[PDB]
DNA sequence: ACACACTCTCCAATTCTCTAA
DNA sequence: TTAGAGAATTGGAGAGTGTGTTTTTTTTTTTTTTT
């Protein structure tokens, strides 16, 4: 009933929008996109607010006043999706190329309807019915920066923000599968042969049932309406949920969450377990009909997604733009990348260089193989660290957990073999049975870190056997019978029996693992804490420096930063280097010697069990990883001898 | 109607007379106006109910007996005062029509209206009351609509409307249907302007009488409270709290036609006006405290004074007292630029004969640390001590609850092997991680551990190895910074001294009591708590080359020289030296660690480790 | 309905009823009452309604002259003998057992220090015929609980966690808080209670951190126990019951049994014990301190040339205070110290 | 307040009848 | 034989009224404390 004044007039802002779309350039930037839309080449338009800020600054420096459109579309974001769409529809250019127009049902229907009106004469339909494109806003760069550039945790999203454009940081908990949602519905009248349309915005609607057209009415033609899919307009819909990071929850509270909606080409971007910076519009969800009359003033709410930024680029997302090319050329031209990359893993830890080199080869991994008859062979590498207390095992393990784009960390005592693999939970109130994957599934195509491996129960450790070699999980339980994919490499850490390693016994007595499991690790590294006045002094001088400066001590060596390291590793995981006959003869001859030496010494104090055929393929996998890191397309004997050295060094700790 | 204006005038006279409230309005406004140009303070003021009594008794009793007729005009007058004071020009679209007035809160002298949930009675309805109890439940936060704004497409005019519900206002009005208008009076189609509309936060809680007051094992009684705007989420379950607000009734009570024959009663609530906690830990320093703390720190031997003032009722064990003081101060926690973490908190273990004050000394820490949890070793399971699953929801254990605090474990030797191994992560990585059916999560647990145990043979046997006397694995003993062995060696003068000491202790009488009625210098514990709090918040000592020169030499000699030492020596021993030196420098309020601190830390570690100084 | 009215083999019938204004909050559960009210029906089959009643009416520290008697008792020169004689008078002999029960009923004095440490007031005794004394103690004590070693539930003596969500319940150590508790066979204690009673006795608390529960329970009580090892160290005094076989005693008991089949009284003594606990909490004189410390070092030296420990010196002090409490003397004296060490011969 | 089921009422469309050219 | 003036019978347009709606196992997988 009443009315107020406000500082904003939308006519001025509409004029600014139509100038911006036809003038801005880094021809003008957005007219190329609209030409691609007109050619049917492109389905969505992404508006950059950095452009609008730049445009405002340039117009100001030319000595003229202008409205602050950037804050104006952040404060009340919902309304401007319509203004930009009307401007785009007004200014859309004509096609540059032939289209085959007859493929469109709506074109035929509207052409015939226009012809009917033309004959009869001897808005027509809602404009939403012919918008072939989607439109989204991208928030301000924080380095140019405003609230949309600054991430909020899910607790900080108060009721003040309803209507605004914001950014949210958290973990995704669940994702729905895609289904269609109506936008414009189409009907046919039987007796008078005429078509009518209806537009849907709310969660529910009543379909039409009477032909209220004036011509039909004046012919007293009370015809029947029928619905049609073939000329209705749908859009893809998906719903998700986001939840705050566990390390940001205040003490004694339960974590909170938000509902996310996604439409258009942005669909199936999110996935469960992702850590992500989502940005969008935060809105209420009104009730409808009789429910609204007795629901009260408490409103449900949700987030309309507009753009999504991931924290770590998955290795599958790689493509060699020249921006990346220029950076990998730095490492390639500098040379000796193997040592530099290994030295760059956890620089705050002194020494341990061979362990770091082994863990770099774990990050790269071997080549997947699939024979013409259907047999397949594991490409992943498995590694284990066995050693005394206080030698940085947990610390080094947790450092590698940062580099990998997909990975999880777990400890032996806190873990169930079920929850480690996959569980059949009677989760809903409806008594339904549903399968939910465990840690080894969440680490699919990544690394799984298992600390305190010696504390985990002997029965529960057997769950890992199938995943380690076959990279799959098989379940046959109440109402569920399926196989899941688990393409994951395992890294584990343990103390020997009795804690500190005991020289009175053999290595196998100290290790205390069964034969079938000890074989599934490609490398097991044995590391012992033996005092030395000389080495202890150097280690202490290094650690004390680190505590003093927060920096590793350096005179010669500069580590590569983790980002450039990820780019190099991601580029290196694409190569698939092949073997050759000269190399094959050498490794074939090496394998015989290993088994003969094992047979000779099964009695001996220097025994470590017997070399199985899985030790041959371990050599091939390590060799191929080394070939990948030098960006080759061919394994070289130089790789094989290093792969043998790296296996030999694991046992030298036994000899003080 | 006319009476509303006069009440606004009379409260304006009060606000002009008692000027300390104008300063409050103005200071909040200028603070908010400053940082807006770069957190924000709420538009709320607390008035002393005594000032209002001395100013006008007729207004005082009106606020206190008829709040629905006196609180609204008073609050209106406060908003006019804040609005007439100068404010930033050219407000934005949302600021122009925020629908956000200032709000009141009260303190002091409620008299007869200070109550508890058991005694709140139908006579007190519509009065302003104060209640005390324990929070038991809290709802989720929800937004609530109060105003909406609409733009008319053809005419270019902005329209608006307001909404009400029975819990939003002290006075009573016709309820509103929560519908959005789609069309103008003149037939123009409307659009809704989110971001210009106004929504507020809402939360319901429940408060119950304290269990100490429950009669005869009878059922306890409780009330529901309504909170909104600024008051949301300032409490959690288990809090002891005192709430101020108006006590009111709701609904039709079955007189709107029902099957009950109207035997059922009306519903009732308290509308939260102000909330205060109860202490049942933290203290806030006055200026004089800063002066005294800084002056005392320049004595020659502050460490001796402070350490001997811990548990003066316990004779002897000087070194354990010094170790506990350094534990309460702690080291400095490091986070490196690559995300790597280096531990800061000190863990202590003590093992010894029966009756040698182990449990009695362990009990003292629980009553001087700001956050402390206590448990017996056999009364706790691995999951209960770290974390457990429920319904999926994950529930914290004792080590997760004391995050930045200390945890005390008595009868540590009785804990089973299956329970002990759950602790190996928490004492170094300072986290808890679970991987069970339907759950994977990491939790933080940053505390310091102090614990007591009995040796294997019931008394310590010097004629057998320390490993034979102490049945724990080497990987666990390595995680304790200081390991103390203590025994009851029989000697004449020692026995005489201790016995005379406990007899002098048992002859104490508290100050306010006649004899037989039932109930160097030492700083008082209430001052020592302030000293520890100040030192832990305001000083962060950085390491120096002179300290490092001592630390490196001591570590390499101690590790390499062959001796009958009672604990394994590893890379973690070096960190114990750095932590102890940093904590001693912090006692001294020094901005940097010096050679003296490193020397003292070495002389404490040598005593505990090699048994002799 | 009244228990002595119900027809045999049937569970009792009941009614629901309403009251308002001054008739509210006038009664509590378990009380027998008489009611006047209108009997009527209300809405809540065919043409059928529930009945109820509207109520219109319901029916259901010391004086000066009391404490004068207690004061006259306090100045009697043989009061200690009188109270010992008044305890289980049918039981022959066993003088020191009766003396120890008097001290257990009277207790020492609680104290709190400037550094916040807290000093225990209670007493604990163990007995190795014996069934009668625990029942007598249960009757004479102002507050009392009686149990056998297995306990009344899966809580046992101390407490336990049970299960569906988990919960916790306390046994007969938590329930007797503030009073006395007596155990009828201490050897039948359960495994969890064997370890948990250490905290319950030394700390006067029970603490649990299991299945997400994290709480501490109060256990402020004096324990009397009997049976038929290291657990004896928890008690202040231990004694073994003794018997005599006079035929006249059994004949007298049998004659009394036939009579039912065909010195100070309990209530007065209970009220006196209550009065003394409320009025007096006495302190050691310096002479007692020199005496006790000299005796302590003497016993340790004698044992060294041939154990006593501080946790037993602090028990002798509590016994000494409890002996001075009978006289209402505000100070304890060498007279009490002598009888305290004399009675300390548990062996 | 929002789709439905059911009731009530008035008005004009229709067919039938009579009269005269 | 056509047609036009007047009367009677019926249909359904459409207006009105009242109404209803939100909201002890038994079998099977998994974690936890208890003997
Ligand atoms: N070479 C090293 N360089 C730097 N710090 C080291 C080195 N070796 C050991 N440390 C320190 O040793 C401490 C303990 O490391 P941590 O990873 O917890 O040991 P761990 O091998 O997991 N021992 P445990 O879990 O008992 O088997 C850390 O603070 C490290 O800084
Ligand atoms: N200076 C002291 N030295 C030793 N014990 C003392 C001292 N002062 C008091 N005590 C008393 O010693 C008794 C036993 O102390 P407590 O701390 O329980 O020993 P403990 O080491 O825990 N023995 P235990 O429970 O068998 O492991 C208490 O009653 C204390 O009051
Ligand atoms: Mg570790
Ligand atoms: Mg003790
Ligand atoms: Zn039609």
Question: Cα C185–C191–C192 angle (5° rounding)?
Answer: 110
B402 to chain C, closest Cα gap in Å: 12
Residue with tokens 């580099």: A403
Q: How far apart, in whole angstroms, are the C-alpha atoms of residue A347 and residue A556?
A: 13
Q: What is the DSSP letter of A196?
A: E
Q: Is C298 helix (H, G, I), strand (E, B) or coil?
A: helix
Residue of B nearest to A10 (CA): B156
Question: Going by C-beta distance under 8 Å and a sequence separation of 6 or more, which residues neighbour residue B488?
Answer: B353, B354, B355, B356, C309
B545 closest CA partner among B593, B596, B478: B593
DSSP B40-73: PPPSEEEEEHHHHHHH-HHHHHHHHH-HHHHHHH
Q: How far apart, in whole angstroms, are the C-alpha atoms of residue A212 and residue A197?
A: 12
Q: Is B5 helix (H, G, I), strand (E, B) or coil?
A: helix
Residues B59 and B11 sit within 8 Å (Cβ to Cβ): yes
The H or E element spanning position C332 is strand C331-332
Least CB–CB distance from B548: residue in A7, A163, A544: A544
Q: How far apart, in whole angstroms, are the C-alpha atoms of residue C279 and residue A343?
A: 79
Q: Is B444 helix (H, G, I), strand (E, B) or coil?
A: strand
Least CB–CB distance from B339: residue in A158, A296, A402: A402
- CB-based contact (8 Å) between C304 and chain B? yes
> Which residues 150-189 of chain B have a CB under 7 Å from nucleic chain D?
177, 179
What is the CB-side half-sphere exposure of residue A390 using CA atoms within 13 A?
A: 21
Q: How many other C-beta atoms lie within 10 A of the C-beta of residue A366?
A: 23
Instruction: List residues bridging with B135 in a β-sheet.
Output: B207
Question: Going by C-beta distance under 8 Å and a sequence separation of 6 or more, which residues neighbour residue A417?
Answer: A457, A459, A460, A461, A462, A463, A464
Question: Cα A310–A316–A322 angle (5° rounding)?
Answer: 85
Q: How far apart, in whole angstroms, are the C-alpha atoms of residue A73 and residue A52?
A: 11
DSSP B491-515: -HHHHHHHHHHHHHHHT---TT--T
Residues A565 and A325 sit within 8 Å (Cβ to Cβ): no
Q: How far apart, in whole angstroms, are the C-alpha atoms of residue C114 and residue B329?
A: 23
Q: How far apart, in whole angstroms, are the C-alpha atoms of residue A362 and residue A130?
A: 53
Residues A390 and A374 sit within 8 Å (Cβ to Cβ): no
Q: How far apart, in whole angstroms, are the C-alpha atoms of residue A6 and residue C301?
A: 96
Question: Going by C-beta distance under 8 Å and a sequence separation of 6 or more, which residues neighbour residue A603?
Answer: none
Give all chains having 3 or more CB-to-CB distances under 8 Å with chain B: A, C
Q: How far apart, in whole angstroms, are the C-alpha atoms of residue A407 and residue A423?
A: 20
* DSSP H helix total and E strand total for chain B: 20, 21
The count of CB pairs under 8 A between chains A and B is 251
> Which residues 196-215 of chain C have a CB under 7 Å from nucleic chain E?
210-211
A487 closest CA partner among A438, A527, A447: A447
β-strands B267-277, B222-228 pairing:
parallel
Kindly state if the Cβ of C118 falls inside 6 Å of ligand 2. Answer: no
Q: How far apart, in whole angstroms, are the C-alpha atoms of residue B431 and residue B341?
A: 12
Q: Which two tokens stand for residue A51?
A: 């452009």
β-strands C180-183, C144-147 pairing:
parallel
Question: Cα C86–C87–C91 angle (5° rounding)?
Answer: 110
| Interaxial angle between packed helices C334-343 and C310-326, expressed in degrees from 0 to 180 and rounded to the nearest 10 | 120
Question: Would the CA dihedral through A364, A365, A366, A368 be positive or negative?
Answer: negative
Q: Which two tokens stand for residue B187?
A: 């037939």
Q: How far apart, in whole angstroms, are the C-alpha atoms of residue B227 and residue A129?
A: 47
Residues A176 and A236 sit within 8 Å (Cβ to Cβ): no
Q: How many other C-beta atoms lie within 10 A of the C-beta of residue B277?
A: 11
| Interaxial angle between packed helices A10-23 and A29-38, expressed in degrees from 0 to 180 and rounded to the nearest 10 | 80
Could you say which nucleotides of strand D lie within 7 A of any protein CB atom? 1-4
Q: How far apart, in whole angstroms, are the C-alpha atoms of residue A377 and residue A140?
A: 48
Q: Which two tokens stand for residue A270?
A: 């999110």
Q: How far apart, in whole angstroms, are the C-alpha atoms of residue A517 and residue A82?
A: 62
Question: Cα B373–B204–B279 angle (5° rounding)?
Answer: 35
Instruction: List residues bridging with A310 in a β-sheet.
Output: A276
Kindly state if the Cβ of C267 falls inside 6 Å of ligand 2. Answer: no
β-strands B341-342, B439-444 pairing:
unpaired
The H or E element spanning position B410 is strand B406-410
Residue of C nearest to B515 (CA): C330
Residue with tokens 């004029």: A15
Q: How many angstroms is C1' of D11 away from CA of B275? A: 73
The H or E element spanning position B377 is none
Question: Cα A423–A429–A431 angle (5° rounding)?
Answer: 65
Could you say which nucleotides of strand E lie within 7 A of any protein CB atom? 20-23, 28-35
Question: Going by C-beta distance under 8 Å and a sequence separation of 6 or more, which residues neighbour residue A57?
Answer: none
Residues C100 and C239 sit within 8 Å (Cβ to Cβ): yes
For the CA atoms of A350, A353, A358, A360, the dihedral, rounded to the nearest 10 degrees, stands at 70
B225 closest CA partner among B215, B211, B239: B239
Instruction: List residues bridging with C237 in a β-sheet.
Output: C125
Question: Going by C-beta distance under 8 Å and a sequence separation of 6 or more, which residues neighbour residue A226?
Answer: A187, A188, A190
B57 closest CA partner among B70, B38, B68, B46: B70
Tell me how far apart the terminal alpha carbons of chain A are, to the nearest angstrom: 90
Ranges of H-type helices in A27-154: 29-38, 49-61, 69-75, 77-91, 105-120
DSSP C98-157: HHHHHHHHH----EE-TT--EE-----EEE--HHHHHHHHHHHSSSEEEE-TT-SSTT-S
Residue with tokens 């003396």: C99
Q: How far apart, in whole angstroms, are the C-alpha atoms of residue A232 and residue A11?
A: 33
Q: How far apart, in whole angstroms, are the C-alpha atoms of residue A59 and residue B530?
A: 59
* DSSP H helix total and E strand total for chain A: 23, 21
Q: What is the DSSP letter of C246?
A: -
Residues B176 and A294 sit within 8 Å (Cβ to Cβ): no
DSSP B248-313: EEES-TT-SS-TTTT-S--EEEEEEEEEEE---------HHHHHHHHHHTTSTTHHHHHHHTSSTT
Binding residues of B for ATP: 352-359
A547 to chain B, closest Cα gap in Å: 8
Name the experiment that determined this structure.
cryo-EM
Burial letters A261-276, b for 16+ CB under 10 A, else e: bbbeebeebbeeebeb
Q: Where are the domains of chain C?
A: 64-347
Q: How far apart, in whole angstroms, are the C-alpha atoms of residue A547 and residue B580?
A: 14
The H or E element spanning position A575 is none
Question: Would the CA dihedral through B587, B592, B594, B598 be positive or negative?
Answer: positive
Query: Which ligand is the nearest neighbour of the Cα of B316?
Result: 2
- CB-based contact (8 Å) between C278 and chain B? yes
Q: How many angstroms is C1' of D11 away from CA of A193? A: 33
A413 closest CA partner among A461, A456, A449, A464: A456
- From A391, A450, A455, the mutation candidate for ligand 1 (largest count of ligand atoms within 8 A of CB) is A391
Residue of B nearest to C300 (CA): B490
**CB-neighbour burial class of residue B207 (10 A; exposed 0-12, middle 13-18, buried 19+):** buried
Residue with tokens 């450790």: A461
Q: How far apart, in whole angstroms, are the C-alpha atoms of residue B590 and residue B603?
A: 20
Q: How far apart, in whole angstroms, are the C-alpha atoms of residue B356 and residue B544?
A: 40
Q: How far apart, in whole angstroms, are the C-alpha atoms of residue C109 and residue B201?
A: 55
Q: Is A169 helix (H, G, I), strand (E, B) or coil?
A: strand
Question: Would the CA dihedral through B280, B286, B292, B293 be positive or negative?
Answer: positive
Query: Which ligand is the nearest neighbour of the Cα of C311?
Result: 2
Q: How many other C-beta atoms lie within 10 A of the C-beta of residue B90?
A: 7
| Interaxial angle between packed helices A10-23 and A49-61, expressed in degrees from 0 to 180 and rounded to the nearest 10 | 100
Kindly state if the Cβ of B498 falls inside 6 Å of ligand 2. Answer: yes
Q: Which residues of B are less than 8 Å from C230 in CB distance?
A: 458
Q: Which two tokens stand for residue A600?
A: 């000779």
Residues B136 and B240 sit within 8 Å (Cβ to Cβ): no
Q: How far apart, in whole angstroms, are the C-alpha atoms of residue B592 and residue A420?
A: 47
C181 closest CA partner among C192, C170, C195: C170
- The domain of A327 spans 321-650
Question: Going by C-beta distance under 8 Å and a sequence separation of 6 or more, which residues neighbour residue A36?
Answer: A42
Burial letters A78-103, b for 16+ CB under 10 A, else e: bbbbebbbebbeeeeeeeeeeeeeee
- Compute the residue count for chain A: 656
C124 touches strand E (CB under 7 A): no
- Compute the residue count for chain C: 347
- Compute the residue count for chain B: 613
Q: How many other C-beta atoms lie within 10 A of the C-beta of residue A548?
A: 17
Residue range C64-347 in CATH 3.40.50.2000? no
C134 closest CA partner among C155, C156, C149, C115: C149
Residues B373 and B413 sit within 8 Å (Cβ to Cβ): no
Q: How far apart, in whole angstroms, are the C-alpha atoms of residue B492 and residue B473?
A: 37
Residues C183 and C223 sit within 8 Å (Cβ to Cβ): yes
Q: What is the CA B174 to chain-centroid distance, rounded?
A: 43
Q: How far apart, in whole angstroms, are the C-alpha atoms of residue B489 and residue B495?
A: 9
Q: How far apart, in whole angstroms, are the C-alpha atoms of residue C158 and residue B65?
A: 51
Breaks in chain C (C–N > 2.5 Å) following residue: 44, 60, 128, 163, 228, 262, 306
User: Would the CB atoms of B556 and A537 count as touching at under 8 Å?
Assistant: yes
Q: How far apart, in whole angstroms, are the C-alpha atoms of residue A311 and residue B575?
A: 33
DSSP B206-233: EEE--GGG--TTPPP-EEEEEEEGGGTT
Q: Which two tokens stand for residue A480?
A: 């569920």
DSSP B122-152: GGGTTSEEEEEEEEEEEPPPEEEEEEEEEEE
Residue with tokens 């209106």: B76
A48 closest CA partner among A137, A122, A142: A137
Q: Which two tokens stand for residue B348?
A: 């202590």
- E runs forming strands in C148-255: 159-162, 167-170, 180-183, 205-210, 213-218, 222-226, 237-239
> Which residues 206-235 of chain A have a CB under 7 Å from nucleic chain D?
206
**CB-neighbour burial class of residue B154 (10 A; exposed 0-12, middle 13-18, buried 19+):** exposed
Q: How far apart, in whole angstroms, are the C-alpha atoms of residue B44 and residue B105?
A: 7
Task: Name the CA radius of gyration of chain B, rounded.
Answer: 32
A38 φψ region: left (φ > 0), alpha (ψ -120 to 50), beta (else):
alpha
Question: Going by C-beta distance under 8 Å and a sequence separation of 6 or more, which residues neighbour residue C117?
Answer: B311, B313, B314, B360, B363, B364
C81-90: long-range pairs with CB below 8 Å, 24+ = C82/C263, C82/C264, C83/C264, C83/C269, C83/C326, C85/C263, C86/C263, C86/C264, C86/C265, C86/C269, C87/C136, C87/C140, C88/C132, C88/C133, C88/C136, C89/C263, C90/C132, C90/C253
For residue A527, the domain's CATH number is 3.40.50.300
Resolution in A: 3.5
Question: Going by C-beta distance under 8 Å and a sequence separation of 6 or more, which residues neighbour residue B455?
Answer: B351, B352, B353, B461, B469, B470
* DSSP H helix total and E strand total for chain C: 10, 16
Residues B457 and B470 sit within 8 Å (Cβ to Cβ): no
Question: Cα B344–B345–B348 angle (5° rounding)?
Answer: 140
Q: How far apart, in whole angstroms, are the C-alpha atoms of residue B13 and residue B94?
A: 32
The H or E element spanning position A137 is strand A134-138
Order of all β-strands in the sheet with C237-239:
C144-147, C180-183, C222-226, C125-127, C237-239
B307 closest CA partner among B322, B320, B328, B323: B322
């Amino acid at each position: 009933l009443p009315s107020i004044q406000l500082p904003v007039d939308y006519n001025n802002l509409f004029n600014e929008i139509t100038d911006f779309l036809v003038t801005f350039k880094q021809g003008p930037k957005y007219m190329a996109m609209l030409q691609k839309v007109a050619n049917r080449e492109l389905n969505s338009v992404i508006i950059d607010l950095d452009d609008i800020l730049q445009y405002q600054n340039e117009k100001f420096l030319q000595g003229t006043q202008a409205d602050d459109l950037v804050s104006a579309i952040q404060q009340n974001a919902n309304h401007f999706t319509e203004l930009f769409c009307r401007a785009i529809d007004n200014n859309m250019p004509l096609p540059t190329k032939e289209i085959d127009y007859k493929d469109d049902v709506l074109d035929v229907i509207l052409n015939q309807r226009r012809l009917r009106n033309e004959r009869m004469l001897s808005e027509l339909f809602p404009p939403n019915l012919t918008r072939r494109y989607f439109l989204y806003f991208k928030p301000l760069s924080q380095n140019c920066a405003a609230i949309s550039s600054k991430p909020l945790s899910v607790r900080q999203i108060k009721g003040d923000f309803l209507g605004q454009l914001i950014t949210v940081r958290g973990i995704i908990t669940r994702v729905s599968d895609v289904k269609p949602a109506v936008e414009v519905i189409a009907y046919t009248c039987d007796q008078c042969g005429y078509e009518v349309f209806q537009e849907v915005n709310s969660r529910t609607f009543t379909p039409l049932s009477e032909c209220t057209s004036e011509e039909c009415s004046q012919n007293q033609t009370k015809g029947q309406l029928f619905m049609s899919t073939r000329a209705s307009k749908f859009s893809a819909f998906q719903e998700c949920k986001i939840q705050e990071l566990s390390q940001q929850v205040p003490v004694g509270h339960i974590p909170r969450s938000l509902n996310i909606h996604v439409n258009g080409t942005l669909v199936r971007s999110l996935s469960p377990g992702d850590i992500v910076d989502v940005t969008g519009i935060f809105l209420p969800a009104p009730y409808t009909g009789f429910k609204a009359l007795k629901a009260g003033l408490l409103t449900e709410t949700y987030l309309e997604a507009q753009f999504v930024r991931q924290h770590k680029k998955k290795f599958a997302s790689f493509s060699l733009t020249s921006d990346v090319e220029e950076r990998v050329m730095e490492l390639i031209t500098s040379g000796d990348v193997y040592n530099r990359l290994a030295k760059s893993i956890a620089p705050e830890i002194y020494g341990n260089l061979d362990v770091k080199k082994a863990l770099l080869l774990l990050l790269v991994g071997g080549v997947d193989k699939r024979v013409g008859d259907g047999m397949k062979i594991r490409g992943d590498i498995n590694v284990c660290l066995m050693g005394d207390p206080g030698v940085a095992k947990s610390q080094l393990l947790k450092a590698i957990c940062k580099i990998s784009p997909r990975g999880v960390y777990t400890t032996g005592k806190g873990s169930s073999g079920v929850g480690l693999t996959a569980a059949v939970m009677k989760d809903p109130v409806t008594d339904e049975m549903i399968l939910e994957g465990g840690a080894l599934v969440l680490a699919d195509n990544g690394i799984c870190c298992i600390d305190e491996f010696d504390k985990m129960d002997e029965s529960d450790r057997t769950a890992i056997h199938e995943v380690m070699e076959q990279q799959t999980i098989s379940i046959s339980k109440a109402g569920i019978n399926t196989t899941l994919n688990a393409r994951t490499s395992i890294l584990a850490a343990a103390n020997p029996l009795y804690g500190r390693y005991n020289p009175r016994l053999s290595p196998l007595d100290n290790i205390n693992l069964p034969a079938a499991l000890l074989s599934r690790f490609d490398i097991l590294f044995l590391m012992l804490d033996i005092p030395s006045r000389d080495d202890d002094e150097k280690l202490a001088e290094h650690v004390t420096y680190v505590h003093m400066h927060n920096k590793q001590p350096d005179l010669d060596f500069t580590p590569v930063e983790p980002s450039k390291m990820r780019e190099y590793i991601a580029y290196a995981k694409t190569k698939r280097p092949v073997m050759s006959e000269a190399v094959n003869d050498y490794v074939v001859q090496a394998y015989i010697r290993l088994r003969q030496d094992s047979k000779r010494e099964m009695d001996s104090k220097f025994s470590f069990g017997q070399a199985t055929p899985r030790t041959l393929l371990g050599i091939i996998r390590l060799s191929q990883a080394l070939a990948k890191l030098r960006l080759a397309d061919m394994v070289d004997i130089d790789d094989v001898e290093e792969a043998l050295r790296l296996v030999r060094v694991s046992k030298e700790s036994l000899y003080q | 109607d006319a009476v509303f204006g006069d009440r606004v005038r009379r409260f304006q006279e009060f606000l002009d007379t008692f000027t300390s409230y104008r300063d409050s309005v103005r200071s909040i406004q200028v603070y908010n106006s400053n940082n807006a140009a770069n957190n924000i303070l709420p538009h709320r003021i607390i008035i002393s109910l005594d000032d209002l009594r001395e100013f006008d008794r007729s207004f005082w009793s009106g606020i206190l007996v008829e709040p629905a007729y006196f609180i609204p005009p008073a609050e209106k007058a406060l908003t006019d005062l804040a609005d007439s004071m100068d404010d930033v020009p050219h407000p934005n679209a949302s600021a122009v029509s925020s629908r956000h007035p200032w709000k009141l809160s009260f303190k002091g002298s409620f008299g007869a209206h200070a109550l508890s949930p058991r005694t709140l009675t139908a006579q007190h309805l519509n009065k302003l009351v104060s209640v005390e109890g324990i929070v038991t439940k809290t709802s989720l936060v929800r937004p609530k609509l109060i105003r909406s704004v609409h733009y008319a497409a053809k005419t270019g005019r902005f329209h608006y409307r307001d909404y009400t519900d029975a819990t939003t206002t002290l006075t009573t009005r016709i309820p509103t249907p929560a519908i959005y208008p789609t069309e103008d009076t003149e037939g123009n189609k409307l659009t809704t302007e989110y971001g210009y509309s106004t929504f507020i936060d809402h939360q319901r809680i429940t408060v119950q009488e304290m269990p100490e007051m429950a009669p005869a094992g009878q059922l306890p009684r409780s009330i529901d409270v309504i909170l909104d705007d600024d008051l949301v989420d300032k409490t959690k379950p288990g809090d002891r709290v005192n709430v101020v607000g108006v006590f009111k009734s709701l609904g039709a009570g079955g007189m709107n036609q029902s099957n009950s024959n109207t035997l059922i009663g009306f519903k009732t609530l308290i509308l939260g006006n102000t909330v205060y906690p109860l202490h049942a830990a933290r203290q806030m320093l006055t200026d004089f405290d800063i002066r005294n703390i800084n002056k005392l720190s320049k004595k020659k031997d502050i460490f001796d004074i402070l350490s001997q003032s811990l548990a003066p009722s316990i004779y002897g064990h000087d070194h354990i007292k010094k170790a506990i003081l350094l534990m309460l101060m702690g080291g400095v926690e490091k986070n490196l630029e690559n995300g790597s973490h280096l531990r800061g908190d000190i863990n202590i273990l003590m093992v010894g004969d029966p009756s040698t004050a182990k449990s009695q000394l362990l009990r003292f820490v629980l009553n001087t640390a700001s956050l402390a949890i206590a448990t017996t070793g056999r009364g706790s399971s691995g999951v209960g001590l770290t974390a457990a699953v429920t319904t999926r929801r994950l529930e914290a254990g004792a080590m997760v609850l004391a995050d930045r605090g200390v945890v005390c474990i008595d009868e540590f030797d009785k804990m089973t092997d299956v329970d002990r191994v759950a602790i190996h992560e928490v004492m170094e990585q300072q986290t808890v991680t679970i991987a069970k059916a339907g759950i994977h999560t990491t939790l933080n647990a940053r505390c310091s551990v102090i614990a007591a145990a009995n040796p294997v043979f019931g008394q310590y046997d010097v004629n057998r190895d320390p490993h034979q006397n102490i049945a724990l694995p080497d990987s666990l003993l390595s995680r304790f910074d200081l390991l103390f062995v203590v025994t009851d060696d029989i000697n004449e003068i020692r026995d005489r001294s201790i016995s005379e000491h406990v007899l002098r202790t048992h002859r104490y009488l508290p100050p306010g009591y006649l004899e037989g009625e039932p109930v160097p210098k030492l700083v008082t514990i209430p001052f020592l708590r302030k000293y520890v709090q100040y030192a832990k918040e305001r000083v962060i000592p950085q390491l120096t080359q002179e300290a490092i020169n001592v630390i490196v030499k001591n570590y390499t000699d101690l590790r390499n020289d062959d001796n009958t030492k009672k604990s394994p020596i590893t890379a973690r021993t070096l960190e114990t030296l750095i932590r102890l030196a940093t904590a001693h420098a912090k006692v001294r309020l020094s901005k940097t660690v010096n050679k003296v601190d490193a020397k003292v830390a070495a002389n404490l570690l040598r005593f505990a480790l090699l048994g002799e100084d | 309905e009244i228990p002595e009215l119900v027809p045999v083999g049937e569970m009792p019938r009941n009614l629901t009823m309403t009251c308002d204004r001054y008739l509210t909050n006038k009664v509590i559960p378990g009380t027998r009452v008489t009611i006047v009210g209108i009997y009527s029906i209300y809405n809540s089959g065919v043409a059928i309604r529930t009945p109820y009643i509207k109520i219109l009416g319901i029916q259901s520290m010391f004086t000066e002259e009391e404490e004068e008697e207690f004061l006259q008792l306090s100045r009697n020169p043989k009061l200690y003998e009188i109270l010992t004689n008044s305890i289980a008078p049918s039981i022959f002999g066993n003088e020191d057992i009766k003396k120890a029960i008097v001290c257990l009923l009277m207790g020492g004095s609680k104290k709190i220090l400037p550094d916040g440490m807290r000093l225990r007031g209670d007493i604990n005794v163990l007995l190795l015929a014996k069934s009668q004394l625990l029942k007598f103690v249960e009757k004479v004590s102002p507050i009392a609980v009686y149990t056998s070693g297995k306990g009344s539930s899966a809580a046992g003596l101390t407490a336990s966690v049970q299960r569906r969500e988990f919960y916790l319940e306390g046994g007969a150590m938590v329930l007797a808080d503030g009073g006395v508790v007596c155990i009828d066979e201490f050897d039948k204690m359960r495994d969890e209670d064997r370890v948990a009673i250490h905290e319950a006795m030394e700390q006067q608390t029970i603490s649990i951190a299991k299945a997400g529960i994290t709480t501490v329970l109060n256990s402020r009580t004096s324990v009397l126990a009997a049976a038929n090892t290291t657990i004896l160290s928890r008690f202040d005094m231990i004694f073994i019951v003794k018997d005599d076989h006079n035929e006249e005693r059994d004949i007298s008991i049998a004659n009394h049994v036939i009579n039912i089949h065909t010195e100070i009284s309990i209530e007065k003594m209970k009220r006196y014990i209550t009065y003394c606990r409320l009025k007096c909490a006495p302190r050691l004189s310096p002479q007692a301190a020199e005496k006790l410390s000299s005796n302590f070092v003497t016993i340790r030296k004698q044992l060294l040339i041939n154990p006593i420990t501080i946790r037993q010196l602090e028990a002798i002090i509590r016994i000494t205070e409890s002996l001075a409490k009978l006289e209402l003397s505000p100070i304890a004296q060498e007279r009490h110290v002598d009888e305290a060490i004399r009675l300390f011969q548990a062996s």
